Structure formats: C-alpha cells, structure tokens
Amino acid sequence: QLTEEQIAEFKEAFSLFDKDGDGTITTKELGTVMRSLGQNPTEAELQDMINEVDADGNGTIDFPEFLTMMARKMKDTDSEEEIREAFRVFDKDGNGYISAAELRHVMTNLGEKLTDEEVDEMIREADIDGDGQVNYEEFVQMM
Amino acid sequence: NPQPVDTSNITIPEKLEYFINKYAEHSHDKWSMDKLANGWIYGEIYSDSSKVQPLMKPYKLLSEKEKEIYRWPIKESLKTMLAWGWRIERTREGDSMALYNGYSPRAIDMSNVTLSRDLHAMAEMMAENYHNIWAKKKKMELESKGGGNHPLLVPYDTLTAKEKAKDREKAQDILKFLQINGYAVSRGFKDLELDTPSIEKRFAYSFLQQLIRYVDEAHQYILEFDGGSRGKGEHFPYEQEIKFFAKVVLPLIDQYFKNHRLYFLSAASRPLCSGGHASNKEKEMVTSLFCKLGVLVRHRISLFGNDATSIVNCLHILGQTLDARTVMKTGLESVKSALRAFLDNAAEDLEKTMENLKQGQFTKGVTQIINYTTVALLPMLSSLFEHIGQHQFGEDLILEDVQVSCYRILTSLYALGTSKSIYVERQRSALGECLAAFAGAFPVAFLETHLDKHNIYSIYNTKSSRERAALSLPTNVEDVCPNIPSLEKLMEEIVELAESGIRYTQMPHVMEVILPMLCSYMSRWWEHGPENNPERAEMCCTALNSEHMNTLLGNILKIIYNNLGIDEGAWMKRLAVFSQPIINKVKPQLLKTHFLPLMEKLKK
Ligand SMILES: [Ca+2]
Ligand SMILES: [Ca+2]
Ligand SMILES: [Ca+2]
Numbered sequence A: 001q002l003t004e005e006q007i008a009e010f011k012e013a014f015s016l017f018d019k020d021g022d023g024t025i026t027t028k029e030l031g032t033v034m035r036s037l038g039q040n041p042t043e044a045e046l047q048d049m050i051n052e053v054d055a056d057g058n059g060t061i062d063f064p065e066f067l068t069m070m071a072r073k074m075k076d077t078d079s080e081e082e083i084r085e086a087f088r089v090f091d092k093d094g095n096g097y098i099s100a101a102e103l104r105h106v107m108t109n110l111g112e113k114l115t116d117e118e119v120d121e122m123i124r125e126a127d128i129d130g131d132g133q134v135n136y137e138e139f140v141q142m143m
Numbered sequence B: 001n002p003q004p005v006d007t008s009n010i011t012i013p014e015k016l017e018y019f020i021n022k023y024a025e026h027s028h029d030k031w032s033m034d035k036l037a038n039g040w041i042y043g044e045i046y047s048d049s050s051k052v053q054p055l056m057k058p059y060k061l062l063s064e065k066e067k068e069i070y071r072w073p074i075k076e077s078l079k080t081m082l083a084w085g086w087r088i089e090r091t092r093e094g095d096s097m098a099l100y101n102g103y104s105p106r107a108i109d110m111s112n113v114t115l116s117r118d119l120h121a122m123a124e125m126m127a128e129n130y131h132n133i134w135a136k137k138k139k140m141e142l143e144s145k146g147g148g149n150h151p152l153l154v155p156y157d158t159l160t161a162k163e164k165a166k167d168r169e170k171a172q173d174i175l176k177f178l179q180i181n182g183y184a185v186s187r188g189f190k191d192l193e194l195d196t197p198s199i200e201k202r203f204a205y206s207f208l209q210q211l212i213r214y215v216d217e218a219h220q221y222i223l224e225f226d227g228g229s230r231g232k233g234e235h236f237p238y239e240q241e242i243k244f245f246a247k248v249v250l251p252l253i254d255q256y257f258k259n260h261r262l263y264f265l266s267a268a269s270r271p272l273c274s275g276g277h278a279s280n281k282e283k284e285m286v287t288s289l290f291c292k293l294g295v296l297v298r299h300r301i302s303l304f305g306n307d308a309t310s311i312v313n314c315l316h317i318l319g320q321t322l323d324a325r326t327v328m329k330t331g332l333e334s335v336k337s338a339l340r341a342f343l344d345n346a347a348e349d350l351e352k353t354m355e356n357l358k359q360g361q362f363t364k365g366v367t368q369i370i371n372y373t374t375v376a377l378l379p380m381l382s383s384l385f386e387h388i389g390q391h392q393f394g395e396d397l398i399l400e401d402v403q404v405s406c407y408r409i410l411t412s413l414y415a416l417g418t419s420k421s422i423y424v425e426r427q428r429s430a431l432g433e434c435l436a437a438f439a440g441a442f443p444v445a446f447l448e449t450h451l452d453k454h455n456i457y458s459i460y461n462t463k464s465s466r467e468r469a470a471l472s473l474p475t476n477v478e479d480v481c482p483n484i485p486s487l488e489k490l491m492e493e494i495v496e497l498a499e500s501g502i503r504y505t506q507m508p509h510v511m512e513v514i515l516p517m518l519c520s521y522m523s524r525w526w527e528h529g530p531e532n533n534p535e536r537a538e539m540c541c542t543a544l545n546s547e548h549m550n551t552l553l554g555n556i557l558k559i560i561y562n563n564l565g566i567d568e569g570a571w572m573k574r575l576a577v578f579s580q581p582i583i584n585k586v587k588p589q590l591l592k593t594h595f596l597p598l599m600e601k602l603k604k
Helices: A004-017 A027-036 A043-053 A063-072 A078-090 A103-107 A116-126 A136-142 B017-038 B064-082 B093-100 B117-145 B161-181 B203-227 B239-259 B261-265 B280-297 B308-320 B325-329 B333-359 B365-391 B402-418 B422-426 B428-441 B459-470 B487-500 B508-528 B546-566 B571-585 B596-603
Strands: none
Touching: A004 A027, A004 A063, A027 A043, A043 A063, A078 A136, A103 A116, A116 A136, B017 B064, B017 B161, B064 B117, B117 B161, B203 B239, B203 B280, B239 B261, B239 B308, B261 B308, B280 B308, B280 B325, B280 B333, B308 B365, B333 B365, B333 B402, B365 B428, B365 B508, B402 B428, B402 B508, B422 B428, B428 B508, B428 B571, B487 B508, B487 B546, B508 B571, B546 B596
C-alpha cells in the first residue's frame, strides 16, 4: 500500500540514521543523533523506546520494521509540506524567490564555510530555470 | 602457489669462474672468522663428538665438496640472475688482477659503500625470488610432514622486515662483493622505440574510441527499440544494455568532461605549457561524439526514463567542451557531414515545431518532440552559440553555408520568440540567454548589413558570386534573414521603447530576447570595430561611437528605473547573468558616479 517513491524516500531516510550501513540502528547509533539535536537521553529511555518499534525483538530495527512505524503515522502530505515549510523559512527575503546571499548564511549554522561566490555557481546549477534566485520550484527540482 | 624460476636453460660461464672462486674464498673467510669468534679453533682431527673443527685451514687446503657448497648457492644465484636477462659486461679488474696474479684472514665488509636505487629494486626483487625458492623447498617439506603450516608461507611483501632481513642481506652482500670486485651487472634490455607521437596510446583517445562504439551500439539498440515500437511489447533483452549505457556511459562522460574541461578546451594554449595538449584528432572525434549523441537524443526522449535531464546536462557540458577551429582547419568528412546534417536536423526540427505547435493544439512522438523543444533543445542551442562565441572559433566554424544556416535558424527562432503563448511565456527566459549566446557567436554583425560588406570575413563576399549561387544564398546578405532588424533599427526600437516605458506583461518577448541578445552581441564588435580595435580603420565589422553607447545605456537604465516600480522582478535577475558581461564591459570611470545611483537603489 505504501507508494513506491515513498519507500525510496524511506530508503534514504533510513540511511540518514543508519550511519554504519548495516541496516541496523543500534541504541548508541541512534543516541548520538539525539544529542546532536540537543536532547539529553538516558540509556534506559532510548532502550525502552526502541523496544516498542522492534517487532522482531533483536534490539535493532531493520527497514521492514522501520516501514511499519513509518506507516503508523500520516505522512500523506508532510513530505512536500516540510519542503515548502523550509522554502518559506529560508525565504528571508519574502519575495517568493530565495536569494543565494543568505544561502551561505543558513548553511553556516551547521558549521560549513563554503565560499560566497561558489554557492551561486551551485544555485545556477539549481537554477536550470535560470532565475538567478531560487524559488520553491527550484527547491522541488532540488528535491 | 609459488611459481618457479627456471634455471635449466641457462648455465654458468667460465670467465665468471675467477669471481666465483674469489667469492667462495670470501665466504670461507667470513665463515672462518665466524667460527673463530665463536671459539671454534683448528683441530687435529675432524670429529664432531670431540667438539673440535680443523677447517680454519686455507681455502687452498679445503676439500672439493666444501667448495661445492660455496659454489652451489653462488652458481644458482648466478643462473637465476642470467636467466632474468641481466647482461654482464666487460670491466677493468679482470686485466688488473691478471697483471697481478697461524694465518689471520680478513674479509672486506659489504656495509660501507651503498648500492644505487635501480639495482636496489633489482636486489629486492631477486631476494623476493630467493625467498620464493625457500618457500618452494619449505613447501615440499610441508607436504612431507603433512601439517604444521609455517607462518612464513605468506608472500615476500607480506613478510615483515625481520623476515625479509636474511634474503635482503644476501642480495646486498652478494651484489656488493660483485661491485667491490668491480663486475658491473645491469638490466639486459634498453627500450627499442617509443611510439610517443601515436595518439592511440593516449588514455583519452582509447576511452573515446570506447565511447563512440558504445554510442553506436546504443544507437543500434534504439533502432531495435524502434523496430519493436510498432509492436506493443518493447521489453527486449537490450534493456540491461540500455540502462547500463544510461547509468554508466552518460554519467562517466559527464564526470570525465567536467574534470578535464581544461584539457579539452585548450591544447595547452593558455594553461599548462608543459602538457595537457589535447590532440587535434582527439578534438575531431570529440566533436563527432557530441554530434552523434545529439542525433541519438533527438526524437527518442520518451524512451529514456527521466534521465533525459542528465543527457541534456551531458550535451550541455559537451557543448562547453567543443572546439571548432581545429575541426575546420583539419576536419574529417564524417564530422563535416555530421555537422552539416546537424544544422539540417535543427532546420526541419524548428520547421516542424512551428508546424505542430500551431496545428496540433488539440488532438508519444508529438509529446516527446514538444518536450524536446521546450526544455532539451533551446539550452542546447544556447550552449552551442555560447562556446562558439566564447572561443571565437565560430569565425571559421560557421564561415561557409553555416552563416546562412545559422541566420535562417535565427529567423525561425526570432519568429518563435515573436509568437507568444503559455509555453512561450514559460520559456521567455531561455530565449534571452540563447540569443545572447547567438549574438556573441555570430561573426559578422547580423543586425547591420551596412559594414558587413566592408568586413572581408563574410559568407557572401568570401564565397563570391559563384559559390553565392552554389550555396543557399539569394544574393542578399541581409535579405536571406529578413525578420532580424539592424543595429540602426534596434536603436530606434530601444529609444522609443525607453520613451514609452512598456510593461513586462505587454511585450515580454522584447526584453526576454533582445536585451541579452545585445548584451552579448556588443562584446565581439568591441574588438571588431573601432570600439576596441582602433586600428584596421574602416575595415572593421561595424563602427560605433561613445555617444551612441551612452545613449543606449541611458535608455536601458531609464527603463530599468521605471521598472524598479514593479519590484523589477527576478526576470532581470535572469537577464543579470548576461548583464555580468555588461558590468565587466562598463568602464570604471562610469563606476565612479555614473552608476552608483542604481546600485544604491539596489541596496534599497
Ligand atoms: Ca526487529
Ligand atoms: Ca529569499
Ligand atoms: Ca530560481
């Protein structure tokens, strides 16, 4: 019942949390992500919450189990809604087209230092439409 | 599995026997010294049980067999060096010691002088072989016992330094005694001939033959898919081959041509005077590959599964990496025919586009050609004109018959731009950059015919009154491309356009075709007029004056000023890509106090 590109988007989302590449999310592997988002978990809390998703009981959820928890929730339109949610908040200009000037300004938040000029070389690649200023449609091309 | 080195075919020579006996004496000397330091001293009788040793006696008095266990390793090492193809040449010391001819011996130490690097690699390799021989005998010993794998059965390189130590030390000390004697041994072979001028050895050349015959295989695969396209089932065994092509060759071409663009573009012209010289035949076959890829992608987009955008990007970067003057000065007939038929293909393609976009508004081949026209064609032609005008190779690329082909293509493109619909509004942006590239590409001033006659490098004048009729030339340079205006005509167009102040929603085609058109037009006739070519007086392609320059600047800036009141949009942000050449064009004197108002408004 799950639509084919959704699993493919669930593929990459699964790999976004499966750093080691074996298809198994260990508690420590999941735990480091939650510190990276600011929350400070106890080991028991992580291991408790990981049990409910684990239908097999092996202690590490595989992708078939991962789909079931993904199917648990309504991601009916949340995917492109989040895509538009980012395009709205990245649109600091508010013109409806996102300039490249603040593209370096938000990617610095994670700690990247890529040069100012080179991104608008990459936004030009994004701007196959050639806008010179990225919109949601370019973001849809990006994603 | 150790592979043996055969030594039966080779045999020991006799002039070497002097050094063989000398090194046997040296081995006896080192062995005698070893046992004296160990405490072994001369004994009356050779008894192992009495724990004595008489063999400190001189090598003259050593028996034949003891010489055989010195000569044995020596002559097998010599047989495995001569069996390698290591020649031995003539030295001085044979003649020198020929003109020579309670005892304490002394052995020269091999430690002091150092070996050269080449023969050091030679010695390491031959010690690898000696370790391999040890592995041989140890292996037969291991089938004899039946078990107990010796940990040293791993290859020589897998061995550690301590494990390599004995065999290496043998290599140094034997070759070192050879050199202290003076006998110099080296590689037996010197290279016979280098086929350096051959382009076939170039990895790019080989990869390119690979690329073209895979492209031809893919074209035959598309012909197979076309013969099965009349049938209902296009599922063929060639599905694996076509997806291999699409997800390997095209990405591989893409990465290769972005990584080595500097190689492809310049045959060591501007950068890297030492190397990086792209061959002329290499450029020829690169252009052939681009042409056949363009033919393959044409009329067949629907078959490709959304990787048509990847193919468009590949064709785009191939366009930026094309070369034309090399092809024209030295070109093969297949490439000539491919380019002529590519211009012709663009001809009937544009013609059928004007036909179908009008006729078949209401009713798959038609859909794939419409999509091709909308996205996969105009950026393609734009990039073609872009590299043509960037490298100026178009001067001789489009010299004969391709002036008229490009200028009738200009008529068709200009008519398409003047025609407006929803799909044309969607592609207003593409026409700007495309016509910018074409205006920067076209060598003669296709707008003004006035001074194109005074320009020698023109289709009609260069091909004269007989090739005039031979080609597709109606004897009129300006009339063969009727719809396109002149510089004068576009000048009054611009002046009343400024005096009017039209809205974008009214005349979108004007500012989304002609403005980038002129913005990249102007650059070539800088150097082809008195503009940046004050010399070649009255022979220039066109003549322009600073007064006209300032007038057109004032008109464009004033329409931009009126145009600030409608947000000014991202559509001049689109035109800004080719206004970047204009803002590099503009002299810094203007950048003092003539344009600061408008960038201040931009800062607003
Ligand atoms: Ca499980
Ligand atoms: Ca923005
Ligand atoms: Ca854009």
